[PDB]
Design an enzyme around this catalytic site. Structure first.
Site, PDB file in Angstrom:
ATOM      1  N   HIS A 131      -6.245 -48.749  23.684  1.00 22.53           N
ATOM      2  CA  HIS A 131      -6.977 -47.630  24.273  1.00 22.53           C
ATOM      3  C   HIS A 131      -6.547 -46.291  23.680  1.00 22.53           C
ATOM      4  CE1 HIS A 131      -8.421 -44.827  27.413  1.00 22.53           C
ATOM      5  NE2 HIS A 131      -9.377 -45.728  27.555  1.00 22.53           N
TER       6      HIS A 131
ATOM      7  N   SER B  69     -13.775 -42.433  28.500  1.00 26.17           N
ATOM      8  CA  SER B  69     -12.590 -42.291  27.654  1.00 26.17           C
ATOM      9  C   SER B  69     -12.948 -41.965  26.218  1.00 26.17           C
ATOM     10  CB  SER B  69     -11.761 -43.576  27.647  1.00 26.17           C
ATOM     11  OG  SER B  69     -11.264 -43.868  28.925  1.00 26.17           O
TER      12      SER B  69
ATOM     13  N   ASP C  63      -1.986 -41.083  26.935  1.00 25.66           N
ATOM     14  CA  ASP C  63      -2.709 -42.332  27.154  1.00 25.66           C
ATOM     15  C   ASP C  63      -1.673 -43.433  27.335  1.00 25.66           C
ATOM     16  OD1 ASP C  63      -4.794 -44.477  26.981  1.00 25.66           O
ATOM     17  OD2 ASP C  63      -6.057 -42.816  26.297  1.00 25.66           O
TER      18      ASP C  63
END
Ligand SMILES: [Ca+2]
Ligand code: NA
Length: 934
Positions: free
Chosen positions: A97, A414, A34
């Site tokens: 994230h 995600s 990521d």
């Protein structure tokens, strides 16, 4: 004391059932690739480090040495390895994230957490390998970098690799070879790779519906498009753990809220209805209260800013959609802002007591959406026509770990992907005991098939049909059903738990192989749904339409064996009405659903997809704007009162307007041409008030300029594209601009002389990606292809003779065997300079200038004007005079500045300017014309 976990309250995918069978990941390693991570988050802990694969940095360094890995570091007992594969990046590392994704997979928050409930991810006792990758130097470099992260993760012992990132619409075929081999290497080692489907909905994006004429509206990109990965779509379950508000109705009543910033908990707020918040009168009574505002008309941030201006202490925004989804509201200067459903907003709007209280702890409440695929979730098919996504998992408003030891809700595929990744890891562990004689690759293949087969096909209650498999794949993951499964279903070649039929006629067969891994024969009933796209007017609704359901059949599969079944499909009677809606063809798709008895629950389901038509040869390019009957295109709205108005770029910084298929060229006014030929270096905002503008070929201003350009067409309807290749920058070239409905390859421009000869060929643009949105955050609605620029010269570098040529643009779809497509434009080349008056006389009494002769031009006259250039606050400013009907020009005595001052004009201020439709141009000082006497 000991706090409950979120999963203790809220386990939509039934992970606990699989954990009871297979554990929680102790001794296992999983990897997340990521954009960055908070490596110190409190969620990164193990209950018993003595059970871990890597008990110390020295254990890790030993494994690093065995595989020649000379980079990366041990972080803590949970985060056994971190490496940044994009350290040459100049931008700051984003930590939110990757932390959030990793928390869903493997978070293990301690009871000392400040949160009400402990985040405990799917494999909370596994160790993490955290691999940072970010785009820095292009997409091919990016894929080479994450290919190495994949390979390193495998060699450091990861059993699952989660990749909650992607780039929309990209073709798998265009990935670097080493990236393709990395996927194959994971498969060969039994390492699962799970990919997010993407958050781009369909062609057009989350604010738009695709046109029914154009069924290839998928936007899944890479890495998801790799067949070996398990690609995960997002849906909302029919209930979700949510923060809540309490209100007294006409009894108490709790409502879900999704809050940005923080309201004061347990405080009774007054609220006031402010309509859509589009004017100040709306907020007349919100001072000191919460503004209740309906979604619509204007941006969220605008609604919130205006409420703050009127003294509101907070904002409630309620949906303008029925059965909608919570939308995370923007943070506008810390203003508390919460999103609620339409039904709850309408309730508050008409409620007697306008007081509302925010609760400090969340609880599970029904969702406004019900069980529904997320509007943002990316649709298949992939660029080369493969079926993605593979499966769905909850991805709405998922609470997980974010930067600086905090927690927050995020929505996206995600978030769906790491939940599936953890279920995959645990099922692989289960299979180490259940199928010990399989190889790791065999267990991985089985796990993917069981997850997809046992996934529950989600049903659209509003439409009374199952969501399309191009939206939900094989259905919503269910770890309880997966863990219990002793059967699975594949296509006839046993490659995957989905059936791709490519092109079909109205009658076809869906063939499924039913695999029985139990020691006893099993009897199943099975039924195929037959369905297509729902259409509203000229648009796909992005919703399913059931055609019929086939009759139930049954089959007995012997123990430890497989048996093939076939379901005949006949949609012939629907074809007339379906073609009326979807004239270029339509999908015929659905699910073969398996049950132990028709009255029991679905046990397995396998999706099938065919296309009633010729999918590979669907048009890849939106037709040129010039050919639109009403002047509109997918991304461009016409001026209703002037369908031929088609303005150029102006002084815009971003190219958000006029995104369509067309040819570009440039307008260079005479003052700039003159300054360049005189060698003036600093022109813009200094030497001239006029601008060089990129415009559409075939467009022309009016002689009395109204600041707009208009399409002109030959009598045959083609746009009057014409160039004057003389190097002055005025209409010297044409260049292809395309709104691509589909990906394409080997885009090349060539020029035919209309006598049988190709006289010029451009360089090739090898890869073309569809224009799947019109937004700076993703992609613009059209693409300008610099390699196609034609300067009017042949393949030997010689300007072609004056005449009309075919500018032909060729491009091929990605689909196997598709025919090359092309789009053609007539382009006139003419370099004849206008022949114009070389003398003039001037009548002082009426100020009329008489020219000694009229313009003679090869192309028709475009503009014949007298310019006057006068000083406006130190800037030479040019305006224009059109001829009188007797051919003279009346020269004014003065001009007026913008600020209103009178500026006297001198004869030396006037210039005679003649331009033809190819851009050939002359400009002569009026004083020179008047001196043109012997
Ligand atoms: Ca020119
Ligand atoms: Na399924």
């Amino acid at each position: 004391t000991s706090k409950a976990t979120i999963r203790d309250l809220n386990d939509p995918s039934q992970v606990k059932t699989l954990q009871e069978k297979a554990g929680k990941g102790a001794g296992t390693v999983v990897a997340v690739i990521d954009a960055g991570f908070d490596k110190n988050h409190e969620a990164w802990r193990l209950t018993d480090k003595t059970k871990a694969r890597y008990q110390s940095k020295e254990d890790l360094e030993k494994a690093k040495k065995e595989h020649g890995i000379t980079y990366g570091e041990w972080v803590n007992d949970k985060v056994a390895y971190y490496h940044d594969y994009s350290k040459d990046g100049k931008t700051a590392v984003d930590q939110e994230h990757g932390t959030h994704v990793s928390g869903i997979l493997s978070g293990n928050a301690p009871s000392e957490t400040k949160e009400p409930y402990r985040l405990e991810g799917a494999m909370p006792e596994a160790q993490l390998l955290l691999m940072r990758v970010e785009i820095v130097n292009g997409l091919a470099d990016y894929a080479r970098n994450y290919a190495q992260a994949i390979r390193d993760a495998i060699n450091l012992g990861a059993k699952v690799i989660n990749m909650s990132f992607g780039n929309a619409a990209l073709a798998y075929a265009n990935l670097p070879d080493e990236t393709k081999k990395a996927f194959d290497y994971a498969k060969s080692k039994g390492v699962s790779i799970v990919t997010s489907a993407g958050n781009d909905s369909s062609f057009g994006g989350k604010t738009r519906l695709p046109l029914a004429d154009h069924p290839d509206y998928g936007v899944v990109g890479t890495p998801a498009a790799a067949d070996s990965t398990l690609t995960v779509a997002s849906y909302s379950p029919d209930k979700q753990l949510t923060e809540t508000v309490r209100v007294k109705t006409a009894q108490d009543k709790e409502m879900p809220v999704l809050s940005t910033n923080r309201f004061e908990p347990n405080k009774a707020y007054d609220y006031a209805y402010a309509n859509r918040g589009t004017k100040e009168d709306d907020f007349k009574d919100v001072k000191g209260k919460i503004a209740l505002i309906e979604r619509g008309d204007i941006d969220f941030k605008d609604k919130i800013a205006k409420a703050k201006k009127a003294g509101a202490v907070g904002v409630l925004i309620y949906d303008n959609q029925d059965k909608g989804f919570p939308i995370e509201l923007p943070n506008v200067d810390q203003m508390p802002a919460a999103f609620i459903s339409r039904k709850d907003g309408l309730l508050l709007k008409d409620n007697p007591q306008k007081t509302i209280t925010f609760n400090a702890t969340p609880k599970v409440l029904p969702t406004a959406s019900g069980t529904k695929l997320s509007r943002f979730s990316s649709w298949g098919l992939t660029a080369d026509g493969n079926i993605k996504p593979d499966i769905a998992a909850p991805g709405q408003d998922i609470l997980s770990s974010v930067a600086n030891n905090k927690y927050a809700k995020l929505s996206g595929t995600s978030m769906s992907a790491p939940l599936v990744a953890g279920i995959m890891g645990l099922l692989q562990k289960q299979y180490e005991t259940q199928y010990p004689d399989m190889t790791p690759s065999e267990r991985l293949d089985l796990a993917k098939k069981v997850l997809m087969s046992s996934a529950t096909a989600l049903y659209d209650e509003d439409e009374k049909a199952y969501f399309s498999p191009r939206q939900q794949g094989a259905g919503a993951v269910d770890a309880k059903k997966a863990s219990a499964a002793t059967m699975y279903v594949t296509d006839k070649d046993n490659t995957s738990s989905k059936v791709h039929l490519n092109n079909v006629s109205d009658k076809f067969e869906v063939t499924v192989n039913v695999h029985n891994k139990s020691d006893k024969p099993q009897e199943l009933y099975y039924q195929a749904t037959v369905q297509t796209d729902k259409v509203d007017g000229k648009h796909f609704a992005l919703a399913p339409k059931v055609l019929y359901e086939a009759s139930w059949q049954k089959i007995t599969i012997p123990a430890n064996s497989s048996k093939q079944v076939t379901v005949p499909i006949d949609a012939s009677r629907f074809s007339k009405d379906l073609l009326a809606q979807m004239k270029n063809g339509y999908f015929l798709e659905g699910f073969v659903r398996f049950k132990q008895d028709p009255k029991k629950e679905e046990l397995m389901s396998i999706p099938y997809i065919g296309f009633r038509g010729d999918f590979g040869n669907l048009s890849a390019l939106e037709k040129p704007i010039y050919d639109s009957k009403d002047g509109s295109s997918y991304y461009h709205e016409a001026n209703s009162d002037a369908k031929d108005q088609l303005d150029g770029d102006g002084l815009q910084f971003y190219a958000l307007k006029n995104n369509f298929t067309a040819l570009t060229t440039e307008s260079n006014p005479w003052t700039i041409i003159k300054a360049v030929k005189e060698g003036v270096e600093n022109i813009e905002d200094i030497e001239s008030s006029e601008i060089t503008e990129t415009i559409l070929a075939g467009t022309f201003a009016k002689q009395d300029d109204d600041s707009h350009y208009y399409i002109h067409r030959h009598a045959n309807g083609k746009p009057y594209a014409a160039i004057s290749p003389n190097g002055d920058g005025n209409r010297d070239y044409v260049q292809f601009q395309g709104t691509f409905l589909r990906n394409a390859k080997n885009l090349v421009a060539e020029v035919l002389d209309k006598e049988g000869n190709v006289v010029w060929t451009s360089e090739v643009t090898e890869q073309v990606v569809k224009n799947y949105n019109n937004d700076l955050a993703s992609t613009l609605g059209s693409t300008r292809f610099e390699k196609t620029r034609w300067d009017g010269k042949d393949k030997d570098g010689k300007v072609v003779a004056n005449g009309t040529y075919t500018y032909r643009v060729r491009y091929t779809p990605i689909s196997s065997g598709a025919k090359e497509q092309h789009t053609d434009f007539d382009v006139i080349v003419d370099n004849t300079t206008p022949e114009v008056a070389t003398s003039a006389t001037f009548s002082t009494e009426d100020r009329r200038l008489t020219l000694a002769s009229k313009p003679k031009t090869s192309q028709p006259v475009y503009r014949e004007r007298i310019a006057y250039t006068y000083m406006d606050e130190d800037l030479p400013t040019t305006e224009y005079i059109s001829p009188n009907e007797d051919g003279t020009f009346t020269l004014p005595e003065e001009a007026e500045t913008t600020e209103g001052a009178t500026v006297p004009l001198k004869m030396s201020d006037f210039t005679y300017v003649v331009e033809d439709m190819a851009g050939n141009i002359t400009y002569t000082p009026v004083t020179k014309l008047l001196e043109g006497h012997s």
